[model samples]
Target: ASIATKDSICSGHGGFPSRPPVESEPLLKVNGVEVLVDGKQYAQHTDGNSTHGGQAISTRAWFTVNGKGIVCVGDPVSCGSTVAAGDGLVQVS
Candidate 1:
C-alpha cells in the first residue's frame, strides 16, 4: 500500500490569471492479488514477459492535471512492448 501526492501551480497563457497551487493525491492499495485505487478498475497480476525480456507484474497509481503535467506513484513495472508500466493506475495525457 502506498500514497503519492503532487503539488504544482498552473502555467501557460489562456487569457486567464494563474490560479493557486493544485494538489493531487493518487493512492494505491494492494490487497493480495487484487489492486485497488481511488477510481478505476482493479488491477490483476500478469504472468507475462516484458518485451525487454524482463519479468512483468506490478502496481501503481497516477493523475494528470491539465497544464500542470502528470504525476505518478510507485516504481515502473513491466507492461511489455517497451511500454511504461502503471500496474494499478494509468492516467495518461
Candidate 2:
C-alpha cells in the first residue's frame, strides 16, 4: 500500500480565503485496474496509457482518510457552501 502524506496530496492549503477547497479524496490506482478515490472510480481499461489525463480513473469526489483505510471521525462532507449572487430562477422544460 502506498501512503501519501496530507502535505503532499492536498493542494491549495496555504492560499488565502482557502482557494476553492480542492479534492480531499484519497487517490488509489492499481496497475491492472482503475483508480479509486473516495469510493469514486476513474481511468478504467487504459492500462499503461499516459495520454490525456493518464491511465488512472479521474474524479471530482473528496473525503478525508485515516491511516488505516478508515475515514476520520466527524469528517466534513466534500460538499462546499454555495453563494447565490442573485434571485433569478430558470424554468426547465
Candidate 3:
C-alpha cells in the first residue's frame, strides 16, 4: 500500500505519462520515494494519452490527501482521467 510519489511511474487513459519529481513532503520518504501531495501537476502526456484526442496536462490526486492519504498507489489521476502505472516503488502500509 505504498503511496505514489516522486518518479512513481504513471500511465493512463491513452498513453504513458512522463512523471517528474512530484511536489511532495520535503522531509517525507517512503522506501526512498517521496510522497506526492495535493494539486501537483503531472507532466503533459502527449504519448497518445491525449484523451484519445485532446492532449493535456495531468494534475492532482483525486483522493483526499487528508495529511495522511499521501497519494497512495490506487489513487486516480485527477486532471486527465489517468492512473498510476507503477507501484509506489515498494510495498508499505
Candidate 4:
C-alpha cells in the first residue's frame, strides 16, 4: 500500500462533495502536509457523488500513520463523505 498524503486518495460516491480533510499529526509529513492515516477525517463526496460531509472511518489495517494503520484501498467510512482521489500525490511505501 502507498502512503496517503493530504493529497492521497479520497474515495467517495459519484462526484463527491467538498470538505476539509484535516491531518495534523506531526508523526509524518509529506510535502509539508501530514499524511493520512486510518480514521482520518473523510474527504468530500463528488457532485455525481453525495458531496456529503467529512467524517472519520472505521478501523484501518495494513500501513500506518502516526502509529495507526494508514488508510488503504479498503475500509468503512461514514456519511459517504469520502471524496475521490486526485487532490494530491506522494510516493511512499
Q: What value does the lDDT take at residue 21 in candidate 4?
A: 63
Per-model CA lDDT versus the true structure: 0.27, 0.22, 0.50, 0.52
Could you give the candidate ranking by lDDT, starting with the highest? 4, 3, 1, 2
Between candidates 3 and 4, the TM-score winner: 3
lDDT of 1 by residue, 1-85 (tens): 2322222122212233222112232333323222222222112222343112222122422442332223333333222211222
Candidate 2: segments with Cα more than 4 A from true spot: 4-36, 46-93
TM-scores of the candidates are 0.21, 0.16, 0.54, 0.52
Worst 10 residues of 1 by lDDT: 49-58
Tens-digit lDDT track of model 3 for 1-93:
555666765655445444553455666766665666655656655565343221222233243434434455555565444435445355444
lDDT of 1 at 70: 32
How far in Å is the alpha carbon of 33 misplaced in model 4?
1.6
Residues 1-93, candidate 4: write the lDDT tens digits: 344456554555546544556654677766676766655575445576235656545344544545676653334457654434522354333
The local distance difference test score of model 3 is: 0.50
- TM-score, candidate 2, is 0.16
Better of 1 and 3 by lDDT: 3
lDDT tens per residue, model 2, 4-91: 2122112111121211222334343233222222322112121243211111121212432332131221222232211111111211
Tell me, by TM-score, which candidate is best.
Answer: 3
